[PDB]
Amino acid sequence: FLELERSSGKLEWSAILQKMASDLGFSKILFGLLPKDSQDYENAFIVGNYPAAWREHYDRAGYARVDPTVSHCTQSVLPIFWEPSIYQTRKQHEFFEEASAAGLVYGLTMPLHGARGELGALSLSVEAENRAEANRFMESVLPTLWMLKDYALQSGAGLA
Amino acid sequence: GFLELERSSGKLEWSAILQKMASDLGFSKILFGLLPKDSQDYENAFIVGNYPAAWREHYDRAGYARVDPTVSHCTQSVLPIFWEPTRKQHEFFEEASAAGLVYGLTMPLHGARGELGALSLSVEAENRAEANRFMESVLPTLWMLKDYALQSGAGLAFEH
Ligand SMILES: COc1ccc(C(=O)Oc2c(Br)cc(Br)cc2CNC(=O)c2ccccc2[N+](=O)[O-])cc1
Ligand SMILES: COc1ccc(C(=O)Oc2c(Br)cc(Br)cc2CNC(=O)c2ccccc2[N+](=O)[O-])cc1
């Protein structure tokens, strides 16, 4: 894990982060961090390899206000898994459908809360054939991801 | 199961459960301390564990919260600090050692609502190399435990 802090700068950190993620089995990741008491996303540090069209669609649709993982992150340090039960309203369900259409079906979101009030999320999606396989996979990797998120937060807050 | 923390009733039961989970991971002495957001003193701290009373009393009376290097580390990072040796810092390590607390680590706690604290755990060992091997062997499980303790503990201390 210390290779993240020991990376040279943004590009090497992003690739190392995305590579640790792929080695664990997640082809898609997004790390997002805001400074303490941020009012909007003008100063957000957001990196990863989510598809561009989905990044753009989520911004244009204002999905930070509907995505249930975002409100979760304001309330907890524990992971939220992407499962049917977290999409309660129709509007959350169609967030779910559009993420799915973009290729992001199975996954989880780890909240980020830094020592200087930084607020963020590390999200990772796994390409699996059904929820049973996705869940099995995530169990096997969860303790390692649990460390990764804090090593990512501490190093990324230093970079950002 | 981490679930038994969230379902406990009252600080006695919670602290017992946490102490047992730690003991199972090889740690005989632990201290969980948590302050509300932007605390200026320790008057509203929630501190539970099985550190010895004489050591707790000494640490407070001697002002060791201003000396102990783990405390400033927690204000600056989410990553753990392993216990490894200023002249007052020299005094601090000697007196901890005299109290039986020689090897261990402190896991900083940064809550979703700005709670600040630490989960400190001591391991009994023949020497530091052996202590290190004992801690490394359980570090992924401890990493999950500290965040479960923080999420449940914040509720117990400040909300329910
Ligand atoms: C206030 O502090 C914050 C808030 C938010 C983010 C943050 O990274 O949010 C974003 C952004 Br910005 C853009 C996209 Br595209 C996606 C997310 C997160 N959601 C999922 O991955 C997700 C979550 C559940 C299901 C599907 C997905 N998905 O996007 O495919 C960071 C810091
Ligand atoms: C940032 O908000 C905070 C700050 C601090 C604590 C916190 O719990 O601090 C305490 C207290 Br209060 C009493 C004692 Br006794 C010990 C500690 C911590 N140090 C060690 O365990 C230690 C650390 C290194 C080596 C040895 C030891 N040891 O005590 O044996 C909680 C919340």
Contact B111, A36 (CB under 8 A): no
Q: Which chain B positions have a beta carbon within 8 Å of A69's beta carbon?
A: none
Residue B29's nearest CA partner among B98, B90, B105 is B105
CA nearest to A122, candidates A20, A43, A38: A20
Using the Cβ of B112 and the Cβ atoms of chain A, whether some distance falls under 8 Å is answered with: yes
| Every domain of chain B and the residues it spans | 1-160
Supply the angle between the helices A131-159 and B128-158 in degrees, to the nearest 10.
100
Asked if A48 contacts A71 with a C-beta cutoff of 8 angstroms, the reply is: no
Kindly calculate the radius of gyration of chain A based on its CA atoms and give it in whole angstroms.
15
**CA A27 to each of CA A60, A117, A131, A142, B125: distance values in angstroms, whole numbers, following the listed order:** 24, 29, 16, 16, 41
H-run or E-run covering B31:
strand B29-35
Backbone angles phi, psi at B123, to 5 degrees: -120, 135
The rounded distance, in Å, linking the Cα atoms of B132 and A17 is 27
Distances (CA, A) of A34 to A10, A43, A119, A144: 16, 7, 5, 24
**CA neighbours within 13 Å on the CB side: how many for A32?**
20
Please work out, in degrees rounded to the nearest 5, the angle formed at the alpha carbon of residue B106 by the alpha carbons of A23 and A155: 40
Q: Is B103 in the pocket of ligand 2 (CB under 6 A)?
A: no
d(CA B47, CA B54): 15
Whether residue B119 contacts residue B79, with contact meaning beta carbons closer than 8 Å, is answered with no
Given a contact cutoff of 8 angstroms between Cβ atoms, the answer to whether B15 and B157 are in contact is no
Strand order from edge to edge, sheet including B46-49: B46-49, B29-35, B116-122, B104-110, B81-82
Q: Do B78 and A153 make contact, defined as CB atoms within 8 angstroms? A: yes
Give Cα A150 to chain centroid, integer Å: 13
Q: Measured between alpha carbons, how far is B106 from A53 in angstroms, rounded to an integer?
A: 43
Which residue from A134, A156, A159, A129 is spatially nearest to A20, judged by alpha carbons?
A156
- Homologous superfamily of B1-160 in CATH? Transcription factor LuxR-like, autoinducer-binding domain (3.30.450.80)
**Residue B52 in contact with residue B99, Cβ under 8 Å?**
yes
Indicate the residue type of A106.
Answer: Y
Report how far apart the first and last C-alpha atoms of chain A are (Å, whole number): 18
Counting one residue from A and one from B, how many pairs have CB atoms under 8 Å apart?
52
B54, B100 contact by CB (below 8 A): no
Q: Half-sphere exposure of A18 toward its Cβ, with a 13 Å CA cutoff? A: 14
| SS (HEC) of A22-47 | HHHCCCEEEEEEECCCCCCCCCCEEE
Residues across chain B: 160
Which of A38, A123, A127 is the pocket-test mutation for ligand 1 (most atoms within 8 Å of CB)?
Answer: A123
CA dist B85 and B69 (Å) reads 9
Distance between start and end Cα atoms, chain B: 21
Identity of residue B24? D
- Contacting residues of A for B110, CB less than 8 Å apart: 77, 113-115
B72, B77, B78: which to substitute to probe chain A, counting the most A Cβ within 10 Å?
B78
**A5 CB near a chain B CB, below 8 Å?**
no
Of B112, B140, B141, nearest to A76 by CB-CB distance is: B112
- A55-60, Cβ contacts within 8 angstroms, sequence gap of 24 or more: A57/A98, A57/A102
Q: Could you tell me where the beta strands, DSSP code E, fall in A49-146?
A: 80-81, 106-113, 119-126
Please name the residues in contact with A112: beta carbons below 8 A apart, sequence gap of 6 or more: A32, A33, A73, A118, A119, A120, A121, A122, A149, A152, A153
- Rounded-to-integer distance, Cα B47 and Cα B30, Å: 11
Length of chain A measured in residues: 160
- Most A-contacting residue of B3, B72, B73, B77 (CB-CB within 10 A), to test interface: B77
A12/A98 Cα distance (integer angstroms)? 31
Query: Tokens for B123?
Result: 């391991």
Contact B78, A114 (CB under 8 A): yes
- Kindly state the helix (H) or strand (E) to which residue B93 belongs, with its residue range: helix B87-98
B147 backbone dihedrals φ, ψ, rounded to 5°: -75, -40
